[PDB]
Homo-oligomer: A and B are copies of this chain.
Amino acid sequence: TAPVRQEGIMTQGDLVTVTSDGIDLNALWNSFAESIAIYNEAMDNLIQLLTYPVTVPVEPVVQIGETTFEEATELGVPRGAGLPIEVFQMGYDLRHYDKRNAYSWMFLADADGRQVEAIHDAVLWADKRLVFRKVMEALFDNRTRRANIRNQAYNVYPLYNGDGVPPPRFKNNVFDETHSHYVISHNSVVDSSDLEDLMELLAEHGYSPQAGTQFLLLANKAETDAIRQFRRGVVNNNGATAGYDFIPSPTQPAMMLPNAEGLLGNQPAPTFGGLAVIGSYGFWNIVEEDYIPPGYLVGVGYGGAFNLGNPVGLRQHANPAMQGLRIIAGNYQRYPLVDGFYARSFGTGVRQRGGAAIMQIKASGAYECPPIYKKGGGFLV
């Protein structure tokens, strides 16, 4: 709860005991558990909808050429044919994280078991927050990474970012190496045309409603309060005109309508995965949460003919003994100190670089990663 981080060898004087007033403070450690349970639920739903386990550490992509017929003649012969192919590869990184706890003998002699169980529970909470931060960094952090896999180095990619191999041609759409999914609105407030632009960044690659792709928009309340106002043919922020209505989910409060048939079509389903849907706009299902920072829109495509999966792969270590969160016996095991370690190894990357997009809502300049999910900013959300 409070952002205070006590770090040291736990001594007497760091002991928590029954008060002289008879208040057992060691009963109170797990009293936050329901405010934690809502943050825990929100992180669970985002992680299971944004991640998959990496089973293949390096992924290939290829570019193949073409040929043409020609019109025949009665004495000559047509031109020959051949295909040129080339290939590129991308991976997922892997890093190591650990924590210590340490106690003096005078602490261990007098401590209630509930005080050390509470410290263990705070470590599991920090572990989950570490995993969530690194998953969200894999999606928001615009920069390319490097990693060594089976004794060779690879690029580890976010979504398209103006770096790596260009997206493949789809129909009449062609892309160069500068192509990026991290674009900006070019205006201080969200438009309906921003939701249509963000949608076009997926549809340009054939990931589309017509191909059977489903669409999730994740947004802050600061954006959804504006999107709820969008009405077909009505002028909007920055002089945009809305092409659709915002249609409320069946969990929204009741409203009067100009017609006893209210809508042409259905209301959106109230949950997408485990996430709570407020409504829909065009082909977007809309989920609001402030784990998306203010001024950022995240659009994610699922399913369809291209089989869009969850955007971020989680790589664990290949050895099953190195997988999971693990407790290691410490270097001090006797007197006057005892210590021990917690350790986890994992890492992250994107396979299907076009399956999602991120828009920062601002007037000018390049996309900025929100500091909450910039790689160097720490180990907590």
Contacts and interface: CB of A to CB of B under 8 A. Distances in A.
Nearest to A10: B82
Interface residues of A, number: 32
A341 interface: no
A264 interface: no
A1 B84 contact: no
A290 B83 contact: no
- Could you say how many copies of this chain the assembly holds? 2
Contact of A122 (B8, B83, B172): B83
A152 B21 contact: yes
Contacts of A171: 39, 290
Dominant secondary structure at the A interface: loop
Contacts of A119: 82-83
A168 interface: yes
A87 B10 contact: no
A95 interface: no
A83 to B, nearest CB: 6
A87 B6 contact: no
Interface stretch (A22-30, A199-207, A250-258, A353-361): A22-30
A14 interface: yes
A170 interface: yes
Contacts of A328: none
Contacts of A25: 85, 87
Contacts of A35: 168, 170
A38 to B, nearest CB: 8
A6 B83 contact: yes
A4 interface: yes
A28 B87 contact: yes
A128 interface: no
Interface in A50-101: 82-85, 87
A1 B168 contact: yes
Interface string A217-240: 000000000000000000000000
A85 B290 contact: no
29 contacts: A1-B168, A1-B169, A2-B169, A4-B84, A6-B82, A6-B83, A7-B82, A8-B82, A10-B82, A14-B82, A16-B85, A21-B152, A23-B87, A25-B85, A25-B87, A28-B85, A28-B87, A29-B83, A29-B85, A35-B168, A35-B170, A39-B171, A82-B119, A83-B115, A83-B118, A83-B119, A83-B122, A171-B290, A172-B290
Given A1-B168, A35-B168, A83-B115, 13 more contacts: A6-B82, A6-B83, A10-B82, A16-B85, A25-B85, A25-B87, A28-B85, A29-B83, A39-B171, A82-B119, A83-B118, A83-B119, A83-B122
> Which 10 A-B pairs have CB atoms at the shortest separation, nearest pair first?
A6-B82, A6-B84, A172-B290, A10-B82, A14-B82, A83-B118, A16-B85, A83-B122, A171-B290, A83-B119
Interface of A: 1-2, 4, 6-8, 10, 14, 16, 21, 23, 25, 28-29, 35, 39, 82-85, 87, 115, 118-119, 122, 152, 168-172, 290
